[PDB]
Design a protein around this ligand. Structure first.
Ligand SMILES: [Mg+2]
Ligand SMILES: [Mg+2]
Ligand SMILES: [Mg+2]
Ligand SMILES: [Mg+2]
Ligand SMILES: [Mg+2]
Ligand SMILES: [Mg+2]
Ligand SMILES: [Mg+2]
Ligand SMILES: [Mg+2]
Ligand SMILES: [Mg+2]
Ligand SMILES: [Mg+2]
Ligand SMILES: [Mg+2]
Ligand SMILES: [Mg+2]
Ligand SMILES: [Mg+2]
Ligand SMILES: [Mg+2]
Ligand SMILES: [Mg+2]
Ligand SMILES: [Mg+2]
Ligand SMILES: [Mg+2]
Ligand SMILES: [Mg+2]
Ligand SMILES: [Mg+2]
Ligand SMILES: [Mg+2]
Ligand SMILES: [Mg+2]
Ligand SMILES: [Mg+2]
Ligand code: NA
Ligand code: NA
Ligand code: NA
Ligand code: NA
Lengths: 150, 107
RNA sequence: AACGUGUCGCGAUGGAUGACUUGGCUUCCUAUUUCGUUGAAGAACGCAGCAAAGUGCGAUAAGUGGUAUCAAUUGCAGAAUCAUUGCCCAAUCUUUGAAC
RNA sequence: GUUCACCCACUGACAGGGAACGUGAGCUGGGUUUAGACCGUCGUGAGACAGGUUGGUUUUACCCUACUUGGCUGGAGAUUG
RNA sequence: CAACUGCAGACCGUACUCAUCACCGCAUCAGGUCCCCAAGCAUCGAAUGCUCUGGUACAUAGAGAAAGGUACACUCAG
RNA sequence: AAAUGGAUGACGCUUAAGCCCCAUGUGCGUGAUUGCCCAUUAUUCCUUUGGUGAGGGCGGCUAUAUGUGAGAAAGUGUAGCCCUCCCGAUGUAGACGUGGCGUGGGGGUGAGGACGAAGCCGAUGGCGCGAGCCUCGGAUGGACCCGCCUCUAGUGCAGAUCUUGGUUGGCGUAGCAAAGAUCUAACGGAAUAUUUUUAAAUGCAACGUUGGAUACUGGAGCGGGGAAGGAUUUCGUGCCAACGGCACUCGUACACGAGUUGUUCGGUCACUGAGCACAACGUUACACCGUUUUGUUAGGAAAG
RNA sequence: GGGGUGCCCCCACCCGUCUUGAAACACGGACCAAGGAGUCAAACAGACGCGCAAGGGAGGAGUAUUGUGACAACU
RNA sequence: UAGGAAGACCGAUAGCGAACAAGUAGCGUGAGCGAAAGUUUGAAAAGUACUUUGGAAAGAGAGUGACAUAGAACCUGAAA
């Protein structure tokens, strides 16, 4: 873990390596819940699946569409990444289970230190005109987080 | 490639003669690195009974008597493993050079 | 405001550098020194209790026999001078190939 | 194929020029200017001719700027005193 | 010599495919690749259209009237 | 009189800030001989470096313990033996010099290391004109290595449309648009009906089988059998890491086991064809050459 | 005193190359690590170092030797 | 074919193409062409029993070891 918790006896940690989701999509999905409460972060992910709210795309927004639901975050671009939300819901469930083992109350935890990194790539190939072959690569990611009880 | 060299015969004999004279001056002997503080009468000449020794213990007593053991001890303490790739090429240890003993033949 | 920029601590990605070396390259010397119709060199197919490749071997098939030494082989079994190990006299030596 | 020119009509009038002889990732491909082929003249010949004739692939923008619309949001020491 | 009877009939191939996924094109590539069997109605018919048997729903999908496109898609007064 | 809007450099200037001439501090027909601003120039001061450089000292007796003090080398070149003085200093191609810097190895000499070697990192400073050297810290590493004199060489990189690896904006972008197409209920599956901070506005989307519906191929067929080519892709059970450019609970994927039965079917046994070329003969320095079906090998004694 | 970051006034065309002339609407130039180019031999000449000198020097061979021995010494 | 002796040589993009199941995998109708790759964890596998969440992969604890930021293509671990 890049960072250290202030109080180690009231913190629950969780991480996953080589997750098979797009790194750029998971970067935005995980970043929005930093500083949130555990219950508030789970609620937002459920509403994104229902397509009532959206995930704001702040760094890898490229040329993506505009939407009205991005005004809540103070911008105009956003999306609803299905695969990344489901994977992040599983990670939060594991971190909640770790807190129960230690005896903490999951209803009071606050998320700190979300971090997403690039993982080793996986290689495929595609066929182009005039007998050419070009790379068709996959970009997984690592994710790590912890949460503390105030 | 030209690996070997030729040297004039007279020049080779000149070099040997000069080196022999340099070994007769205690100032030049100390400056090269030899410990000769306990020696007497450089150049050192000893009797011919040395050739009849049969045991290494007898030889070591003779070296201590004439004071040449300090130079032998200097070589012993300087033994160490050579630095660099040379230790992979059949030259693993390095040591210094001690006294000479000149004999009338190989007996 | 966000995006973007810069410095520092920590973490990824990647496999450089150092230290290692049962490999290569170069030079020199010594022999009771030089294959085959008494079927060579090469090529194919097989053989282990569990055995794909490689190694050894040929239906006596990871070996039979002689000799010196003696307690091992080992991943798991399994057997308990006779094995293993080194060397070598006696043998076996599938289908081909100069192939007749 | 033309630029040019020349005729037929209308009109108030049917002026002259420049912009990489404006403008081919805007088009078209008639001309010019490969390889096929015919004629005339020239050359012993292979071949030649700014002489005539017929047939002959027109590739790529998702980047920066310019332009056209379309939105979000700071800023008076033009972010600070 | 014609009948009957008794015994014996050696070797190799044999699965699957033959193509809008099993072969050749760097690939499960709208390209290429020999032979046999071939129903009903309309109709001159192995043209073209539809159907019983056999075989298939496999080729990224959802929402959905901007401009500009491609089309084995059309219509327009004088 | 010309082709984008636009140039005494711009603004502007007319008792000029225009044109031709004349002057100068405090005080312009009473101070005669500098109104003021800007250089890699000139004068002057300090420091460096090189000289066709110029001088001087270098025979150490003045006296001195601690609780006015250090040096002095007869020298090209160094941390220059020391002290005065004078004159030059830029430079492409090019030449030369340097007790000039750095790298791998040999001969010598002197050290260092598990109380931590090499390597690696740096808002670690110090020294040098510079190439560089050295200390410091590592919440780095875990076994070798360096100073000096000499010898030796596969000895110093920013570019060669340089070589080999790795990384990269473009970029979650261009796209994944021929062959018309699927819908419904139940079951299966971890893939749901997942909320503690009434029911909809907080677990979406997607997969296989069976029944039902709808539809396509339309006998020159996404039908049923073979050759060439392929060679276990065939079958059952299990399995979902990677692969089938979306998906998979499906699979020609992965794993473990199974399957091909002939007196008559195809081939050989057992025919000739377009043709081939062993023997024999001839040629060639050399068979690895030529002849060898128009009834037919061979100067040719080929019948067992 | 040194080091880091920001700001102010002033100064300041993109590197390598061919060319009389490059900031060029002249060519090569996305980034990093490790590689990457005057060497060896033989004949001659000049400068400088060393030995001997009207003389200088061999080579090939030979003589004596697990010893720093493919060296060194001697003819 | 059997032995020996060495080196002012190279040191994993070097040295033979090959320090490794190398004339191998792979390519071509064929003659032919032809790699990459140090298993260098640790002195010793002592190679993480067991609890808990998860379908699994894995995560959170516990444990071995001087060191696990030595956890299995596992010494060191640079730059972009
Ligand atoms: Mg393609
Ligand atoms: Mg192709
Ligand atoms: Mg244009
Ligand atoms: Mg004529
Ligand atoms: Mg068929
Ligand atoms: Mg096809
Ligand atoms: Mg009729
Ligand atoms: Mg019909
Ligand atoms: Mg038809
Ligand atoms: Mg009309
Ligand atoms: Mg100069
Ligand atoms: Mg070297
Ligand atoms: Mg480099
Ligand atoms: Mg798109
Ligand atoms: Mg139909
Ligand atoms: Mg058919
Ligand atoms: Mg897929
Ligand atoms: Mg020119
Ligand atoms: Mg230039
Ligand atoms: Mg220009
Ligand atoms: Mg190699
Ligand atoms: Mg190689
Ligand atoms: Na070293
Ligand atoms: Na002016
Ligand atoms: Na014939
Ligand atoms: Na050029």
């Amino acid at each position: 873990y890049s960072r250290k918790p202030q109080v180690s006896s009231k913190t629950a940690k969780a991480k996953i390596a080589d997750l098979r989701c797009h790194y750029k999509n998971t970067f935005e999905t995980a970043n929005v819940i930093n500083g949130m409460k555990l219950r508030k972060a789970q609620q937002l992910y459920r509403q994104v699946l229902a397509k009532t709210r959206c995930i704001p795309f702040k760094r890898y927004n490229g040329k993506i569409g505009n939407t009205a639901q991005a005004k809540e975050w103070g911008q105009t671009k956003g999306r609803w990444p299905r695969k990344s939300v489901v994977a992040m819901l599983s990670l939060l469930k594991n971190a909640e289970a770790n807190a129960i083992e230690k005896g903490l109350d999951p209803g009071k935890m606050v998320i700190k230190h979300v971090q997403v990194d690039q993982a080793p790539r996986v290689r495929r190939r595609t066929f182009r005109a005039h007998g050419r072959i070009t790379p068709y690569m996959r970009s997984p990611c690592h994710v790590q987080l912890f949460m503390t009880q105030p | 490639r030209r690996w070997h060299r030729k040297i004039n015969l007279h020049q080779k004999r000149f070099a040997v003669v000069s080196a022999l004279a340099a070994s007769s001056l205690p100032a030049l002997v100390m400056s090269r690195g030899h410990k000769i503080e306990n020696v007497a009468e450089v150049p050192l000449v000893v009797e011919d009974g040395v050739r009849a020794y049969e045991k290494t213990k007898e030889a070591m007593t003779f070296l201590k008597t004439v004071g040449a053991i300090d130079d032998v001890n200097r070589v012993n303490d300087s033994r160490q493993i050579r630095a660099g790739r040379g230790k992979m090429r059949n030259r693993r240890y390095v040591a210094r050079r001690g006294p000479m003993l000149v004999m009338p033949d190989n007996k």
